[PDB]
Design an enzyme around this catalytic site. Structure first.
Site, PDB file in Angstrom:
ATOM      1  N   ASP A  79       0.835  -1.204   0.000  1.00  0.00           N
ATOM      2  CA  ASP A  79       0.000   0.000   0.000  1.00  0.00           C
ATOM      3  C   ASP A  79       0.873   1.258   0.000  1.00  0.00           C
ATOM      4  O   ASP A  79       1.145   1.858   1.052  1.00  0.00           O
ATOM      5  CB  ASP A  79      -0.936  -0.040   1.209  1.00  0.00           C
ATOM      6  CG  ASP A  79      -1.834   1.188   1.314  1.00  0.00           C
ATOM      7  OD1 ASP A  79      -2.005   1.926   0.325  1.00  0.00           O
ATOM      8  OD2 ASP A  79      -2.377   1.390   2.411  1.00  0.00           O
ATOM      9  N   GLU A  88       4.531  -8.941  -0.522  1.00  0.00           N
ATOM     10  CA  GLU A  88       3.132  -8.647  -0.258  1.00  0.00           C
ATOM     11  C   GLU A  88       2.261  -8.980  -1.456  1.00  0.00           C
ATOM     12  O   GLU A  88       2.470  -8.447  -2.550  1.00  0.00           O
ATOM     13  CB  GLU A  88       2.897  -7.188   0.184  1.00  0.00           C
ATOM     14  CG  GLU A  88       1.401  -6.887   0.214  1.00  0.00           C
ATOM     15  CD  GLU A  88       1.000  -5.676   1.043  1.00  0.00           C
ATOM     16  OE1 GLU A  88       1.856  -5.055   1.699  1.00  0.00           O
ATOM     17  OE2 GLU A  88      -0.206  -5.381   1.042  1.00  0.00           O
ATOM     18  N   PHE A 108      -5.647   7.682   0.936  1.00  0.00           N
ATOM     19  CA  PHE A 108      -5.328   6.580   1.850  1.00  0.00           C
ATOM     20  C   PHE A 108      -3.821   6.303   1.987  1.00  0.00           C
ATOM     21  O   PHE A 108      -3.403   5.497   2.832  1.00  0.00           O
ATOM     22  CB  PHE A 108      -6.124   5.309   1.508  1.00  0.00           C
ATOM     23  CG  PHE A 108      -6.194   4.317   2.637  1.00  0.00           C
ATOM     24  CD1 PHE A 108      -6.865   4.625   3.809  1.00  0.00           C
ATOM     25  CD2 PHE A 108      -5.578   3.066   2.530  1.00  0.00           C
ATOM     26  CE1 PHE A 108      -6.932   3.713   4.867  1.00  0.00           C
ATOM     27  CE2 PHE A 108      -5.647   2.155   3.578  1.00  0.00           C
ATOM     28  CZ  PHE A 108      -6.317   2.478   4.748  1.00  0.00           C
TER      29      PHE A 108
HETATM   30  O1  LIG Z   1      -3.082  -3.318   6.881  1.00  0.00           O
HETATM   31  C1  LIG Z   1      -2.414  -2.374   6.535  1.00  0.00           C
HETATM   32  O2  LIG Z   1      -2.892  -1.060   6.987  1.00  0.00           O
HETATM   33  C2  LIG Z   1      -2.260   0.105   6.448  1.00  0.00           C
HETATM   34  C3  LIG Z   1      -3.394   1.084   6.131  1.00  0.00           C
HETATM   35  O3  LIG Z   1      -2.840   2.323   5.692  1.00  0.00           O
HETATM   36  C4  LIG Z   1      -1.362  -0.198   5.244  1.00  0.00           C
HETATM   37  O4  LIG Z   1      -2.149  -0.568   4.101  1.00  0.00           O
HETATM   38  C5  LIG Z   1      -0.383  -1.320   5.589  1.00  0.00           C
HETATM   39  O5  LIG Z   1       0.593  -1.459   4.550  1.00  0.00           O
HETATM   40  C6  LIG Z   1      -1.178  -2.608   5.704  1.00  0.00           C
HETATM   41  O6  LIG Z   1      -0.373  -3.651   6.282  1.00  0.00           O
HETATM   42 MG   LIG Z   2      -1.673  -4.113   1.762  1.00  0.00          MG
HETATM   43 NA    NA Z   3      -2.448   3.452   3.606  1.00  0.00          NA
END
Ligand SMILES: O=C1O[C@H](CO)[C@H](O)[C@H](O)[C@H]1O
Ligand SMILES: [Mg+2]
Ligand code: NA
Ligand SMILES: [Mg+2]
Ligand SMILES: [Mg+2]
Ligand SMILES: [Mg+2]
Ligand code: NA
Ligand code: NA
Ligand code: NA
Ligand code: NA
Lengths: 1015, 210
Positions: free
Chosen positions: A193, A408, A593
């Protein structure tokens, strides 16, 4: 062969001709240079100006480029991400892959970055030994040519790829050609992410090693029961021809002193029926009373590994910093040097707003400083091995590190589709094993992680065991598939709440307290991610820290996350602004996000950072009468750089203050008896504030750094004295449309149709630009919006419930407006109802009592329908005509604080510029509230009571209508929101309702009272 | 000094409105020069014979949290039934009211007293919106008990059989009442969320004739 084989669409091919991984090398040819970690002439940087051309597919790259510079190529700085130079768009997507999910294939349109460098190689490098090139980071796959000849291929964007160029180079001028593919089969394992970028984004180097060389070394430290004796064990491997005269000497140094040394020929012990490793040797050095490494005191030794002839010829030397520490899990607790850790951690991506994913020393040091200054002792490498310098800095500055493999597969359905597939075991194994081979000698690395959000597959179990076997010194953790699988030594959930269960099928997130005691469970629990810090967040942070302190087996967590992933863009006038998903024409995208940080992209703190600092304090305080009891949560260090300051103030007015030296042992206590406290004659609350100050500067902090604070209420003397008898009496003038009240030069106007105070006058000067009206809504926080994927909408989200209930569209309907003349005042009584589609949401009943002293007492009693979603706030708002420079208040501060995030705030008299009362969250929302306020001053105005407030040039309406902070415009005068009551902000996560029940406005009936007057 | 605190009058004024008379009062309870509580009230009596009572209480932050915040009086009337809209039918307290149900309840007066062998505060009903007793009706959002025994007699009497019915009826109507605890009976056992610790309290009642 290159275009024909398509190695970038084959998980069975992750490299061609790539050398074995190893710890950091420099091939010193002088032992003293190795010891002191000075530059090595045998390790050259190729960072700088390179030639770059962009192509839409590898098929579009001309053959000519292999031997000759492309005329259409530009000259660019390396390392770099080519999106940051504007060649194509960076893409922000969260879960959904940026490419069609069709493994192992990638798009035909595959952005291709053609890098080249013409560079000099000295003749001396080619007459003997081995010349290799090292690419520390290439995203996501690349082929390499040298002087027109194909050398090799590499995948994994986050570990170094190394190639022997000895047979390819010529003395003088040489040319490298590197073809970087944006998408590869490797991309299926890189669904973090974060912004999706590409290019040669870490360092490029040239390393010369002798033919007979150190090819690997591992350093281990083992201890006796009280850590008063250690054995350092160094395993050294060589390549070249084995000869009787060869030796290894390992020497260990405590600063300038050599504390231990050992010398041996090659030839390891027998290990099986075929013998032992004739190309390896293990040295064992005894160390008495070793100075132990921790985040609290990062004691380091230097290990020098000398490859030499017996008679004294140094062939080469390698070296590392050594931290004497034991990491073990015993009886369900994570121990560091026999003591249980409390992880004050944060997740940290490698992100820069100008350079993308390119890291530099200055940024790294800036981050470590800010982290330690804010009481963090740990960092998780979310979600990949970091730039090699990061570990060196964490070793030296002292931070516990979770080192995480670059795996991931979040966007797979189900999440473990690839990780349970043996076809994908080879690619996964390389991301784990090559991390370990590189980073295993760093003392800062205390825990290995198998990656992130890749479900739980059999491949995880296999690689869990691989690490356990190769490196018994460090626990292995992995959250995927329910956070407590057979592939983790630590229960490591993400966004598990403190008290509340989230019983999702297959992968429940139990209350962390409950999780520990599930039948058969014995492991420690450390959240890999928690307290999602997106925008106005960190509500309920103190709830985690109370739990951590009370429960031995709750050993902390890593906040998500350190820094907003915003990127800089420029407008028409060339002015910079913070951009997020979609701002580059990237689609599909997940918008804001990517911004989840405790700090902005330029490392300016969000208000949430002070709450983190306060809850993560290392000193605990109790008050008993005149006795302050200080307790240290340090495991190893004494409070040798700590002074305790105390101050007692009556409603902000200082009455006494002093300082007391702290001499507290680790885990110990100190009692401080405060002197005979003076009795104030005047009414009000006495407040005691204590602060721990560090008088001496450190590696990570300035002299005078405040590391800890706490407040208590002391004696309170309630006011019983009467206000002076005001000689004048306010005159009421009644008209058909207005109730006008006059007292001297002061005038109040109450509209009879609307039922609100529509104007005030001081002399002939208008005071209001919009009438004083009830407000029950707020410009939605990211937590209110409750979105993690831009395509998804949760009907349960607060903003969705508020919208559907008609909170944002409900109109005031007047029920009552009357005026009465009292003996020393004029009384206005009003009642209003807020309705949507025939449903009465709220009723407000008010009295305005203006007496002869010029003060206006406002009493508000509000009813809230029990079946309407609990409202964001219950207060009043107006647009003042005044624009003043300063805001002065007696309340909690100085920084922004909300009901579930106010523990860090202190009750005192605060004075700040108006701008400081606005928090510039990149995605605008309700911001800058201060709670527990008993007095507010702005221009000629003063409000008194017990309220929450924010004050700014931006209305709630503008804030909720604007997507980017840079698009906000200052409105006429100043918008004031004064709340009797305000809903928590939550943040346990930002994609579901997360405000705890005790912070929701569910009482049905609410009372508050304000006094508005001039001064 | 909670049990011996003396009411000191700070303010007592009367005003006539367009359709009502407004009485405004302020009192301070003090012990040895320490102000423990301040009660500020308005009594609004309108043309429909309803007396709206608004109460705002300050509690000194350094005094122990009070057992209750309310009003009490001895009514001249004894009546057969007690009728209320609130939690019931049995005795219920803030930390012991989950069993109680919101409904219209009607009981004989004697059932509004719980005969604990050692007498104490008893018979409270919480979450009450309307209470009826003889010609009187009280409306708001309050807790109450009603009985022939004053709080004074209950605290002065060691055995239930020694209690004597006093003239008329003692009514205690609380805006707020402290939890009763019981995790054990030999140390403070009332949980923090049931202690009256807010410092400032607001409640409102309407007294009328039915
Ligand atoms: O679960 C998660 O929460 C975060 C939300 O920003 C982000 O996506 C991290 O990489 C992920 O592991
Ligand atoms: Mg993720
Ligand atoms: Na995020
Ligand atoms: Mg491949
Ligand atoms: Mg030597
Ligand atoms: Mg505090
Ligand atoms: Na703990
Ligand atoms: Na000290
Ligand atoms: Na907004
Ligand atoms: Na008794």
């Amino acid at each position: 062969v290159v275009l024909q084989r398509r190695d970038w669409e084959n998980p069975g091919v992750t490299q061609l001709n790539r050398l074995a991984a190893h710890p950091p090398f420099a091939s010193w040819r002088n032992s003293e240079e190795a010891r002191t970690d000075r530059p090595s002439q045998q390790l050259r940087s190729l960072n700088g100006e390179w030639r770059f051309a962009w192509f839409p597919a590898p098929e579009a790259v001309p053959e000519s480029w292999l031997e000759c510079d492309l005329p259409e190529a530009d000259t660019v700085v390396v390392p770099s991400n080519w999106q940051m130079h504007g060649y194509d768009a960076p893409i922000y997507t969260n879960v959904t892959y940026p490419i069609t999910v069709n493994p192992p294939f990638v798009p035909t349109e595959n952005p291709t970055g053609c890098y080249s460098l013409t560079f000099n190689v000295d003749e001396s490098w080619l007459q003997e030994g081995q010349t290799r090139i090292i690419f520390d980071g290439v995203n996501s796959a690349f082929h390499l040519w040298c002087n027109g000849r194909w050398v090799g291929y590499g995948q994994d964007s986050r570990l170094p790829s190394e190639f022997d160029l000895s047979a390819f180079l010529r003395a003088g001028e040489n040319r490298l050609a590197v073809m970087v593919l944006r998408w590869s089969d490797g991309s299926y394992l890189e669904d973090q992410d974060m912004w999706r970028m590409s290019g040669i984004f870490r360092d490029v180097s040239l390393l010369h090693k002798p033919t007979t060389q150190i090819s690997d070394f591992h350093v281990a430290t083992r201890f006796n029961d009280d850590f008063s004796r250690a054995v350092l064990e160094a395993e050294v491997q060589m390549c070249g021809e084995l000869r009787d005269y060869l030796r290894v000497t390992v020497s260990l140094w405590q600063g300038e002193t050599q504390v231990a040394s050992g010398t041996a020929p090659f030839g390891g012990e027998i290990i099986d029926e075929r013998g032992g490793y004739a190309d390896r040797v293990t040295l064992r050095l005894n160390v008495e009373n070793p100075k132990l490494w921790s985040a609290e005191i990062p004691n380091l030794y230097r290990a020098v590994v000398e490859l030499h002839t017996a008679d004294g010829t140094l062939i080469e030397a390698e070296a590392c910093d050594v931290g004497f520490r034991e990491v073990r899990i015993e009886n369900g607790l994570l121990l560091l040097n026999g003591k249980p850790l409390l992880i004050r951690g944060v997740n940290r991506h490698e992100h820069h707003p100008l350079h993308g994913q390119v890291m530099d020393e200055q940024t790294m040091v800036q981050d470590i400083l800010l982290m330690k200054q804010n009481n963090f002792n740990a960092v998780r490498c979310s979600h990949y091995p970091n730039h090699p310098l990061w570990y060196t800095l964490c070793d030296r500055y002292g931070l516990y590190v979770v080192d995480e493999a670059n795996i991931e597969t979040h966007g797979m359905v189900p999440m473990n589709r690839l990780t349970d597939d043996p076809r994908w075991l080879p690619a996964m194994s390389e991301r784990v094993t090559r991390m370990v081979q590189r980073d295993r000698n760093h003392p800062s690395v205390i825990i290995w992680s198998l990656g992130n959000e890749s479900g739980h597959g059999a491949n995880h179990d296999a690689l869990y065991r691989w690490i356990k076997s190769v490196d018994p010194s460090r626990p292995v953790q992995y959250e995927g598939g329910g956070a407590d699988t057979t592939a983790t030594d630590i229960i490591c959930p993400m966004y598990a709440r403190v008290d509340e269960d989230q019983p999702f099928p297959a992968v429940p997130k139990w209350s962390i307290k409950k999780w520990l005691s599930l039948p058969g469970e014995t492991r420690p629990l450390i959240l890999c991610e928690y307290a999602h810090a997106m925008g106005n967040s960190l509500g309920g942070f103190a709830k985690y820290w109370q739990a951590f302190r009370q429960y031995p087996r709750l050993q902390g967590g890593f906040v998500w996350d350190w820094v907003d992933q915003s990127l800089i863009k420029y407008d028409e006038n060339g002015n910079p602004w913070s951009a997020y998903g979609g701002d580059f024409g990237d689609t599909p995208n997940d918008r804001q996000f990517c911004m989840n940080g405790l700090v902005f992209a330029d490392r300016t703190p969000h208000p949430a950072l002070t709450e983190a600092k306060h809850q993560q304090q290392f000193f605990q305080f109790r008050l008993s009468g005149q006795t302050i009891e200080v307790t240290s949560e340090y495991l190893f260090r004494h409070s040798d750089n700590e002074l305790l300051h105390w101050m007692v103030a009556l409603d902000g007015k200082p009455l006494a203050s002093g300082e007391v030296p702290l001499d507290v042992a680790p885990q110990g206590k100190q009692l401080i008896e405060l002197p005979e406290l003076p009795q104030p004659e005047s009414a009000g609350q006495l407040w005691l504030t204590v602060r721990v100050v560090q008088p001496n500067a450190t590696a990570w902090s300035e002299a005078g750094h405040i590391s800890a604070w706490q407040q208590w209420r002391l004696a309170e003397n309630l006011s019983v004295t009467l206000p002076a008898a005001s000689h004048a009496i306010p005159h009421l003038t009644t008209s058909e449309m207005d109730f006008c009240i006059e007292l001297g030069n002061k005038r109040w106007q109450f509209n009879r149709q609307s039922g609100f105070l529509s104007q005030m006058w001081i002399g002939d000067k208008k005071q209001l630009l919009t009438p004083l009206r009830d407000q029950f809504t707020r410009a939605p926080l990211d937590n209110d919006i409750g979105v993690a994927e831009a395509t998804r909408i949760d009907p349960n989200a607060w903003v969705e419930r508020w919208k559907a209930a008609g909170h944002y569209q409900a109109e005031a309907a007047l029920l009552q407006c009357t005026a009465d003349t009292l003996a020393d005042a004029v009384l206005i009584t009003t009642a209003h109802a807020w309705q949507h589609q025939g449903k009465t949401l709220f009723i407000s009943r008010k009295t305005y009592r203006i007496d002869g002293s010029g003060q206006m007492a406002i009493t508000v009693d509000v009813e809230v329908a029990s079946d309407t979603p609990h409202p964001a706030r219950i207060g009043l708002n107006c647009q003042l005509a005044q624009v003043a420079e300063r805001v002065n208040w007696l309340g909690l501060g100085p920084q922004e604080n909300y009901p579930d995030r106010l523990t860090a705030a202190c009750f005192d008299r605060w004075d700040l510029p108006l701008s400081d009362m606005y928090t510039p969250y990149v995605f605008p929302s309700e911001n800058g509230l201060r709670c527990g306020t008993r007095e507010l001053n702005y221009g000629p105005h003063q409000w008194r009571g017990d309220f929450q407030f924010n004050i700014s040039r931006y209305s709630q309406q503008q804030l909720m209508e604007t997507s980017h902070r840079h698009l906000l415009h200052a409105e006429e005068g100043t918008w004031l929101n004064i709340d009797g009551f305000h809903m928590g902000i939550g943040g346990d996560d930002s994609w579901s309702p997360s405000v705890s029940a005790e912070f929701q406005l569910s009482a049905g009936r609410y009372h508050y009272q304000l006094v508005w007057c001039q001064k």
